Symmetry: C5
Subunit: 260 residues, 5 copies
């Protein structure tokens, strides 16, 4: 692609606004936004996580207004994003485990992963396994032909984030060797007791242009939005723990760009 001039005028811009729901595992009809209770296999060899226990990446493919070698493409220029429902984590009165005698429920805390991406094509994934002997369950899409090298880097594990409730968070990351046409941002905050720190504002914009002033270019007039918002773990009265996730809002401003 040779990138030429931006189109100007009233009809040269469009905006996408939507929310991606989290896919934490949803172990029953009452537990949307939660995983199944976490269990611990006795050995790496016996690690066989239940589908319902594995958070997955969220993805939405958004069709844009139809535009057309010498063509126009939608270019993603800005992003506003927000985690939706941060105050829900103040419910410390619902089937929780008291922190001490007579105390309030222990709040959602521990390992979090907050991730979002905007691209002109599916997010490209690289597989990395904590334990190459993990048996990923039917219904998930996971690194195939895993070897002990999969624990650090096995270049065979390439995928596209092209399906919902399918790609487990723990075995996939954005592939830094690809994703030229995507902007991605993520933070893993580890530890058993790390407190969530969640900021909300409608005053913050991320610019998606690269160092050449070029944003993601939407192939086939499709925009790809991806997210993960594992906020931590909910501890119930028994001490068992479940991942808890929240939805993510996206607002993307796009402009027409001529390319060859």
């Amino acid at each position: 692609v040779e990138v030429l001039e931006v189109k100007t005028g009233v009809d040269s811009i469009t905006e996408v606004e939507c929310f991606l729901t989290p896919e934490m595992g949803d172990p029953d009809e009452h537990l949307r936004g939660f995983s199944k209770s976490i269990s611990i296999s006795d050995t790496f060899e016996s690690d066989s996580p239940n589908r319902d226990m594995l958070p997955c990446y969220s993805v939405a493919r958004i069709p844009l207004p139809n535009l057309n070698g010498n063509i126009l493409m939608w270019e993603a220029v800005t992003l506003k994003t927000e985690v939706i429902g941060v105050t829900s984590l103040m419910n410390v009165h619902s089937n929780g485990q008291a922190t001490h005698d007579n105390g309030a429920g222990k709040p959602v805390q521990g390992t979090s992963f907050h991730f979002f991406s905007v691209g002109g094509e599916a997010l490209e994934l690289q597989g990395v396994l904590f334990n190459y002997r993990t048996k990923y369950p039917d219904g998930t899409i996971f690194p195939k032909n895993a070897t002990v090298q999969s624990q650090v880097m096995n270049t065979e594990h390439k995928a596209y984030l092209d399906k919902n409730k399918a790609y487990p968070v723990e075995c996939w990351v954005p592939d830094p060797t690809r994703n030229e046409n995507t902007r991605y941002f993520g933070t893993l905050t580890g530890g058993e007791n790390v407190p969530p720190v969640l900021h909300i504002t409608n005053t913050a914009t991320t610019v998606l242009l690269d160092e050449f002033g070029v944003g993601p270019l939407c192939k086939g007039d499709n925009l790809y939005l991806s997210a993960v918002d594992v906020c931590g773990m909910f501890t119930n009265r028994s001490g068992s723990q479940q991942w808890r996730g929240l939805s993510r809002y996206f607002k993307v401003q796009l402009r027409k760009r001529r390319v060859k």
Copy 2:
């Protein structure tokens, strides 16, 4: 609206200065600024929090000087905010029926989950409902997401409301709706965890500019300014181990100017 020029001169500017009190539940005549002690339900199905156990959003509707005889009109535009949590040093009272942190020690200070939030708008803050637990029974006297479903635990677009009443909208059920709020500027931080330390900064030297990327602030419909806040600072643990939310008031000073619009 088409937004046109700012009016200048002595008469073109006004200021709002006020404080919003916290609405933490106020369980008796001695406990203004505190919630009821927290109780925990023994199942998701049995969650039934009492009204005095639920912190609520604070809101004030501030009438501004009348601009038009009949509403090509003038509107008050909010341009700058100075804000501060009032009484941060009260959290140094570690001698008042607190739980000793160890044998012969001082009282445990207020700590744990906090929510610090403020907004300035030309209309009521627009809320989206999100529920930790869709089967929670919210109490009479509160305004809460209705017709809740399991989808209410992640995103149910039915739960739309206006922050239009004080001591009514529970903090835990509602957030600013990011799909709306074009005419409001909002800012909030949830710091979770039972041990997190409050970090509270005070200064009279800090200003927030409320102008958007087009140089336009909140425009006050009907000449009303809307101020909203939550300042849940954490939990107070008393000698028994019982925990209560503790809140503090928030100071607002907003500078406004007259702006011509075509509406």
Copy 3:
């Protein structure tokens, strides 16, 4: 006051001093410490002893007399820092061992670090943790307290006009006043909070407002106020005392012409 031009040339002066902390000083050996904390069994019986209450520090500094349409001293810049930060490395003076054979628990827990520069007394607003607290003789505290005093009672207005008198826990700078003062403070709460104290002679704070005007010194007096509660010292017994440190101030002033 119409504020007119700055004088140039005899037109500048500097104030440099240390403000000592007022932590309660419970005996002849314990300057910089409070009495050990004791806890009431009810809110209604909260009756803290004077030597258990840290107070605001204040100094009124007479400047060179002006005007034998007048000149006023304008405060323009501040250098400040906490003096004696390294004294908190004394972990051998009859403290509580962190574990068997261990060093003494260092000073830690709730801190309040606060400083102000003004051309008049710092203006205060009272806020009470517990409106039924009985404040002791020889302190100046919110009077006619009601339950509304726990969140905001506008009757509680005062001037920081006396050293060792205004308890820290029942007063804050009044944000509705203090037009002629610049103040800065941080409360860090929690029994395990680590002190984080920075020292440098390279950092300057500008005291000019949005209009280029610093505090103007009424009657040619500069007002410096401070609190530096660093945390609590834990004795071998488990008893805890507030520990405070002195604050250095260097203020540069210039002569400014004003009308009345």
Copy 4:
């Protein structure tokens, strides 16, 4: 070398690669982990096994060959100008469901946490190392390259301990640091976060660039058309059901942009 003008026009190249971590790999299933940590019975008997010691990672990357023809008083060198880098596989640390120790009764497994070292360098020659020992009486194992003729001074600064990071799986992290008195032709960056419970904080983005130019606008100059990349990404320790702890490391991605620079040699 006096640095002259940048060549313009085939005047720019890119290196993209990843460096695997070298944590000790104690068996055929534990690539990316160390052996479980054992504690010596006395300070003077410290004697860590090779598979218990994380080492520095290094790769030397050949660049397009310059100066094929005889030149007179001048050569071209590849100059490293920008870096994008990140840790690969940060989400793997969300596996709290295998062989772990419950945080509390009925809880999930304790995640990887505790001491971390995150380090990367880009240079026109091998990273220069200085040795500093926690304990000068530590017996370092066969197959490692460690500070030799150690004395009690080695615990603070013994200027004899000079080395080049010129071998993978060999230089123990705990023995060596970048030599701040050398490394003129390298840019290095590292953070040690100590403590038994410290939580990993790992950021990923493809939007962040580090500029490698010094205060004169000159990046690392690649001697012999070779680029040296070095890394350590000890993320923390994994705790087994038994309580035994193993270091866990992750791979590092590098993308380096280079331009041809004329120099008077």
Copy 5:
């Protein structure tokens, strides 16, 4: 007294060196460590041994001699303009195998953690000190230089306690701080991080420069062509298997660029 123009051309020099820590060095094997910490039986009987007290480090570095010929109303002085600095040997704190106290049953040794003081200064004369005592009744030991004629006022501010950092291994860290009322000809920077579980956070890079010029564009001016470097790098405490705890320190690297400045008497 009057600072005039910078000399150009011969006109620039660099100082590069390390300052070793002075943590107390309680025996021939324990350079960089203090004596294990003991606690007094009463507040009034506090009496720390010399080898239990970290001290300030100082080096005076001779610069190229200036003003070899008679001058008239003016001299040249070396002016310190920039500083690169870093802690040397940060990775040594990853030794969790050397007879430390296990974090839990079968776990690795507790890393160095707890209270830290990281301090450095560059000046054209000795660092000026002010004494502040935690406890004015502490008995400071023979071989140290400590605030004398201590009173209860010494616990917050006794202006009698003025000193110069003019001797290595002598001025205990806990007794002394930079005097903010003096030090016009020094630039100093320090952070105290207090608490028994405080994790070390130590960054290393050769890409960060501190500018030493004041608001008038003048750096420290070196009296008698001597540059004073001072440091403290108490990284935390090491916990032995027994539970006993020792301060652990590390060396600090300094690189200072200086230029010749003309000054009028």
